[PDB]
Design a protein around this ligand. Structure first.
Ligand SMILES: Nc1nc2c(ncn2[C@@H]2O[C@H](COP(=O)(O)OP(=O)(O)OP(=O)(O)O)[C@@H](O)[C@H]2O)c(=O)[nH]1
Ligand SMILES: Nc1nc2c(ncn2[C@@H]2O[C@H](COP(=O)(O)OP(=O)(O)O)[C@@H](O)[C@H]2O)c(=O)[nH]1
Ligand SMILES: Nc1nc2c(ncn2[C@@H]2O[C@H](COP(=O)(O)OP(=O)(O)O)[C@@H](O)[C@H]2O)c(=O)[nH]1
Ligand SMILES: [Mg+2]
Lengths: 426, 429, 50, 426, 213, 212
């Protein structure tokens, strides 16, 4: 049995994880009190991937919610699905990080990491065979980025063999809603390349463009974006919980998509995204899904695939389909456009099919893709960081916590070698 | 998504826009409060509680006419800051309102217009209402044209202007204000519909059966024609025309932009319901010398471009059959380089009725904008009256005292002599 | 036998609609091609001493 | 089986093809909501020619709708069949063209073609086998004349061997709805002759005289004229959709009509056109369709064919009818009035028979005629253009958008070459 | 209705391979009896007892009455008159209730005609085939149930008029290069029309040289 | 890629001289087999079997079709219609593993057809030559491995209409002495072009004389 211990960090982490647990309890058929009210039998076979077995048919999720202030998980607790969470998993702090990577990593996050590591050990010894962890956080924040980076660097050491994913919310290209977030993102993704073997980049403006142009939503709240984030977040582990003609675990998607130990930044996407007024007009076939998986508008990160080359592309499919119309379509993409695919890897596409679709949908598919066009995000963050570090625009909030200037210098250096390594394979 | 911004300048502008916005509230569902108990988005903005704010600016330098409307029935209809007033009027003087009074007002009016234009999705053009014989409409509007051409450019700028009447007039220095207004309207206005107050007096006496009309009886006809021009912007039709449509269908050359407006059924409630009037009746009524609303006869000139706007219960087959009688008639002469002649537009909505008005409720109507050579006679008469005044230097010290130069009249006489030569050379074989 | 009158007593008039929704009313009962009709004609059809 | 794309440009395109899709859905048994309610199995079989099958058993037309103004989009959605169209095929602009070919071809009609091309390519990559394209527009406007011709050019660049068709609305001889109509008709015809395989000239006063003379209607609507036009538009795709004894597609009709590459201007016609009160008394026999299909007043172009010579003739017949009195009548119409047929080709008439009539008729016949009397249209157009061009009438509205006088001269010379070439066969 | 007669003559050609007869005829027999040279292989087909279902039983349909119907110009199934040229070879395939003696008498009756002319170098002229099986009627057809039938396969030089008309038609069409741009543009060059005109002219004057007395 | 097959043709020209065969062709041998007059020496080359590298595993071409491929109008390297001129002298240079009988069978089948028109004074017409070596395969070349290749060189009357337009091209530029001042500027008589025009008219007259 392969079970997953979920982790949270910060306000972004808690708000995304709330909707993630809501949609995975919808998929497995769990009412908000914890019991099982489903109609099928396959929803109870592999429920121990994300849930523990309490007394009397009640299931508790395998999550730990972490924050440095208590005002964010109180909104989670008093939410619709806030009662299934075990109250001992809530680890809060007195004083917040204050949008400071230094405070969230060196001073406030290091006084709380012992308790969270104790809860993680509390949670991971119930695993008969643990597969790996999973974290959701944001890099522009203080306790999200700092606390998540410290948690990742601490639990990689003590659990070396396992698979650790991150559904990080990488910063904005156009309009940033944190002024200091160049510094936090620069110090954060320099941590992420050395510890995580799988990382997904989420761009809020990509989500905005999707819910306006594709979904035709006028006023979307953050729940309407967390639904989209968790749709492709829950579509990765779909082969661990349901059978299929061709399976894909986390390790199967890590081996087939990470050719070198640094290039593990993927850009996700969800295929059947229809507006409510245009849903009836659209047929549901595998060509209709594979047209939209590979489309540039569907991408959840704000980098364009026409500016680079697809290093490797993964594609996990859900529903009752035929292996024709997926195999010939994965051939058709490689044969149709070829300047966007690297020539030194002949077969660039990984394919898997599970036969249990998401609820309410006949067919669905998720995209996971490694492209060297992601370097224009790193170049933009690097130039916005060196436009501020040259004359030290906000350095006094970081040097008082014990951090030095060479930390920023080496974070910039590890950005530059990552950009060079992405360029040299293009 | 089909918005246009109306600008009213001067006493004539405000007193025409009042009738125009009465018609706009009446033929939509908008009460004088603004509540309603591609249709209404064009002329009315939306407030989420259900209110409607017109996209208009009322500009005048004396406060009387515009501060009257703040204490009237439509007080809650217009935005408080969209009514712009001043302290001193221009006093029938182009120089005052163009140099020393219009200098410190235009930085507010342009700010309000830009604030209006930032709430628009797709802007179609501007409608400017003013008068040539005044001091506000002659001076301040004229400066506003270039001031908004600088930062808007290629958008349409239609002009609705009260041309000076040939015989009657309400001032002495109105040749001066009519002459130097045209320095900037020629290089800045795209098209200038002209209406003469004497001709609307003649129509209200002749077509409709009233003697002694007030200004509101004239503004009612003017508002009906104005709403017939922009009817296709708001209401669905079989052949929709735009604000930019007749800026490319009525002016062959960039310096000659002066068509003539004409509304065909002008009939009272006592007389409307004793006869039929469908297509050939109103179409034959539009092309008559009696119903022309500028006191110049198209029999003198040559027709260059006619734009016929139909409204109400209208079938295009009868439209073609009515244009047959016009094209076959020999008393109507077109210029030789326009064998096409006409532009047509058919609208579903019938003209609305006005309680307190004078026009009857009829099922259908047609409004015509025709560019003709025959307005050159009015230009020649007005230039005659100007150089009758200018040789004796009468009423000149006020202009030169308010930040002008004596030679600016010379430039204006030169420019309109060139315009008269242009009107002569267009109409030759 | 019109299907839309635009000279009628009604008020809201739509000009893009057709007076007749099809030309003529003489439609055949059942649609069938010549080949299938004429190839289906194969499915249509003692002395005193022996 | 081979499937056909429909293009719509401006008010003419949108209204004419709205009536076209209404009568096609009538003939194929589709309701306003898009569901099949017909009875005959022949109605559903070749529905892939014009429609795409969606989920749940409903069919979406293969049409793209363009205009520079958003008013006619909401006008065509509010019609009786406005809900049948796909919402993503509504490609509209924010500001109009204003009867300007220059800004409909270079200024405003250029930046939006980069989405109509994407829509057409997207629909035609799901195309099983692309026969050709259809396009209805007007030559007297700024959208159909400018953007339509730009679309034809940019599709002929991409797909070279597919058949391009055009149902254009030529300007009327007497009533000109626009003063600047020759400035758009000339520059659209000059682009049509190098970019189309088939073009049908449809006039408006010819339709008025046809409707008053045959249907005995004193006041038809625009929908009646669009019905008459689309009856011929549906009358040329019968053999692609229904069985027949002598099939003919659009390519086969093009082969047997055009003798030279720059001769593809035809004048269409419909045979059965009688009043309601005189259609139960009249026996619809085979000679009675020929007798009025070849009448000089049964043409939708305002040119009298007795003043010219018939180069080639196409007659597409619909309904249950014998093959003896088809060919006998087509021979008899050639042997008697041989002065109206050119003698350097022996057969002028091409005969095709389909076995399914339009709804409401027992038998029917559609006419396509290639005549040397079509030079009476371009002679008038060139006369008006040269009367309006020596004075620079309305030229500053064209030259200020990115043009020059040499384009006008080279368009007028091309049309004069066309009229000089047509007179050689008479 | 045309395809019914085409099927009838095609069945009557291949009838001898399946049903017993007094004179069996193989498919390889027609090429050895109808063409004198490989350049002339265009004979005509004629079905004689083509008669409706209501007036087929007021007529005496003997062998003599049915054989001379094949030689009538109005009963032929190619619109060319045999009086234009002269017959080169004839192949008769009889059917049904037919005795061979009446076939011999009817064929000898044709030879006495002076309106029907044979070429000099074919003094024999005829080929006889007799089959026992009568022609089977179809339901909802047009022909009647007749007890005997014959189909004619006659090679004649009178078909040279048809080739002359077709060649005049091509010359009237190809003289000013009509429709050629949609022939050369798809995998062809210009000179194939001249080759076909070449061979067809060779065929016409071969036909004129064969019928020389 | 233009020049490599020309090199292959010239290697088949010298193929009969470097190795053995059945009928060997000397350089002075075709020096009299092709040129019939002291003035008409312009033969036309033709290399029939040429296919890409992917279309060799399926079909092998025999003698009776390659010889027919030598005489089809879409092979010869001068864009003139060869049906407009009667053939006068031909030479076929067979290569590779060719038996000699199917060459005479191919010759007979070429003889009986009417497309290939010959003059009356040349009843022999053809000269054949068979080697024992196939063409070599080159690195990076486009040609395929053919066991039996044939190089064809033949005189034709149809070359008369080839330079008959070159004469009109000289005529069009000699009507007003175009470009002659870079010619007569460098020591050439301005009349020298006339005593090449009369020579070319003589050449056209001799080509017409051997046409009848
Ligand atoms: N038809 C019509 N004309 C008007 C109306 N009001 C003013 N006018 C015209 O305007 C002229 C008088 O000048 P105004 O336009 O009123 O001048 P003003 O706008 O008040 O500017 P100042 O005089 O400087 O204050 C008269 O000759 C009228 O022809 C009106 O309500 N209807
Ligand atoms: N895409 C997305 N971004 C979010 C959501 N909630 C918060 N954020 C982002 O999170 C960032 C701020 O996170 P912050 O509160 O500072 O995290 P923390 O202080 O470390 O706990 C902002 O840039 C937001 O855009 C969400 O639901 N979706
Ligand atoms: N027969 C017919 N003619 C139409 C229809 N719609 C528009 N027209 C004609 O098209 C011309 C105007 O086209 P226009 O509005 O300029 O098209 P645009 O390019 O989109 O602006 C007029 O002469 C009308 O007569 C229709 O539905 N049927
Ligand atoms: Mg005033």
């Amino acid at each position: 049995m392969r079970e997953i211990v979920h982790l949270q960090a910060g306000q972004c982490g808690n708000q995304i994880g709330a909707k993630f647990w809501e949609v995975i309890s919808d998929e497995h058929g769990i009412d908000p009190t914890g019991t099982y009210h489903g109609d099928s039998d396959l929803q109870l076979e592999r429920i121990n991937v994300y849930y523990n077995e309490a007394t009397g048919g009640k299931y508790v999720p395998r999550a730990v919610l972490v924050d440095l202030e208590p005002g964010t998980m109180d909104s989670v607790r008093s939410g619709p699905f806030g009662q299934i969470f075990r109250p001992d998993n809530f680890v809060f702090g007195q004083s917040g990080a204050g949008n400071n990577w230094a405070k969230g990593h060196y001073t406030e996050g290091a006084e709380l990491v012992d308790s969270v590591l104790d809860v993680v050990r509390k949670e991971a010894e119930s695993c008969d065979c643990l597969q790996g962890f999973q974290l959701t956080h944001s890099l522009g924040g203080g306790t999200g980025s700092g606390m998540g980076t410290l948690l990742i660097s601490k639990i990689r050491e003590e659990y070396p063999d396992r698979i650790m994913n991150t559904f990080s919310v990488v910063p904005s290209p156009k309009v940033s809603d944190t002024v200091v977030e160049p510094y936090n993102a620069t110090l954060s993704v320099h941590q992420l390349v050395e510890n995580t073997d799988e990382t997904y980049c989420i761009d809020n403006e990509a989500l905005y463009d999707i819910c306006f142009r594709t979904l035709k939503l006028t006023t979307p709240t953050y729940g309407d974006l967390n639904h989209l984030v968790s749709a492709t977040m829950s579509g990765v582990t779909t082969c661990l919980r349901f059978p299929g003609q061709l399976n894909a675990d986390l390790r199967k998607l890590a081996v087939n998509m990470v050719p070198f130990p640094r290039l593990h930044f993927f850009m996700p996407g969800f295929a059947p995204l229809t507006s409510r007024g245009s849903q009836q007009y659209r047929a549901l076939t595998v060509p209709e899904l594979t047209q939209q998986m590979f489309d540039a508008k569907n991408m959840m990160a704000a980098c364009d695939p026409r500016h680079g080359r697809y290093l490797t592309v993964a594609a996990v499919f859900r529903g009752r389909m035929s292996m024709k119309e997926v195999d010939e379509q994965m051939l058709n993409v490689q044969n149709k456009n070829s300047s966007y695919f690297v020539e030194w890897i002949p077969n660039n596409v990984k394919t898997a099919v599970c036969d249990i679709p998401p609820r309410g949908l006949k067919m669905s598919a998720t995209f996971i893709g490694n492209s060297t066009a992601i370097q224009e995000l790193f170049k933009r963050i690097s130039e916005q960081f060196t436009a501020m570090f040259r004359r030290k625009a906000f350095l006094h909030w970081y040097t008082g916590e014990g951090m030095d200037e060479m930390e920023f210098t080496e974070a910039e250096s590890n950005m530059n070698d990552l950009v060079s390594e992405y360029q040299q394979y293009q | 998504m089909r918005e246009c911004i109306s600008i009213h300048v001067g006493q004539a502008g405000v007193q025409i826009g009042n009738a125009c916005w009465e018609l706009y509230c009446l033929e939509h569902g908008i009460q004088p409060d603004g509540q309603m108990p591609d249709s209404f988005n064009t002329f009315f903005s939306e407030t989420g509680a259900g209110k409607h704010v017109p996209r208009a600016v009322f500009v005048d330098l004396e406060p009387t006419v515009v501060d009257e409307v703040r204490t009237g029935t439509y007080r809650q209809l217009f935005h408080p800051e969209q009514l712009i007033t001043g302290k001193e009027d221009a006093a029938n003087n182009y120089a005052r309102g163009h140099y020393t009074i219009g200098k410190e007002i235009v930085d507010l009016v342009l700010d309000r217009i830009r604030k209006l234009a930032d709430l628009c999705t797709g802007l179609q053009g501007f409608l400017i209402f003013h008068s040539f014989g005044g001091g506000t409409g002659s001076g301040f509007a004229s400066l506003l044209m270039e001031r908004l051409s600088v930062d808007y450019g290629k958008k349409s700028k239609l002009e609705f202007a009260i041309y000076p009447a040939p015989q009657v007039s309400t001032a002495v220095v109105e040749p001066y204000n009519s002459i130097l207004t045209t320095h900037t309207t020629l290089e800045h206005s795209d098209c200038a519909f002209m209406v003469d107050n004497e001709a609307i007096y003649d129509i209200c006496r002749r077509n409709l059966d009233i003697e002694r009309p007030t200004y509101t009886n004239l503004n009612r006809l003017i508002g009906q024609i104005v709403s017939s021009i922009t009817a296709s912007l708001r209401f669905d039709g079989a052949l929709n025309v735009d604000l930019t449509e007749f800026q490319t269908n009525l002016v062959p050359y960039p310096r000659i932009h002066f068509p003539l407006a004409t509304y065909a059924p002008v009939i009272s409630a006592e007389k409307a319901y004793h006869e039929q009037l469908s297509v050939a009746e109103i179409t034959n009524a539009c092309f008559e010398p009696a119903n022309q609303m500028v006191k110049c006869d198209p029999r003198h000139g040559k027709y260059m471009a006619c734009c016929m706007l139909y409204r109400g219960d209208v079938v295009p087959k009868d439209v073609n059959a009515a244009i047959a009688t016009i094209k076959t008639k020999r008393t109507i002469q077109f210029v030789d380089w326009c064998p096409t002649g006409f532009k047509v537009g058919i609208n579903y909505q019938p003209p609305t009725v006005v309680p307190g008005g004078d026009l009857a409720k009829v099922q259908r109507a047609v409004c015509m904008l025709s560019n003709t050579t025959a307005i050159a006679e009015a230009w020649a008469r007005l230039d005659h009256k100007l150089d009758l005044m200018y040789a004796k230097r009468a009423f000149v010290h006020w202009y030169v005292g308010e930040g002008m130069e004596e030679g600016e009249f010379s430039e204006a006489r030169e420019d309109l002599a060139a315009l008269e030569k242009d009107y002569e050379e267009v109409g030759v074989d | 036998p019109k299907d839309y009158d635009i000279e009628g007593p009604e008020e809201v008039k739509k000009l893009c609609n057709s007076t007749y929704r099809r030309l003529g009313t003489s439609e055949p009962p059942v649609w069938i091609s010549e080949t299938r009709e004429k190839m289906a004609q194969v499915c249509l059809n003692k002395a005193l001493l022996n």
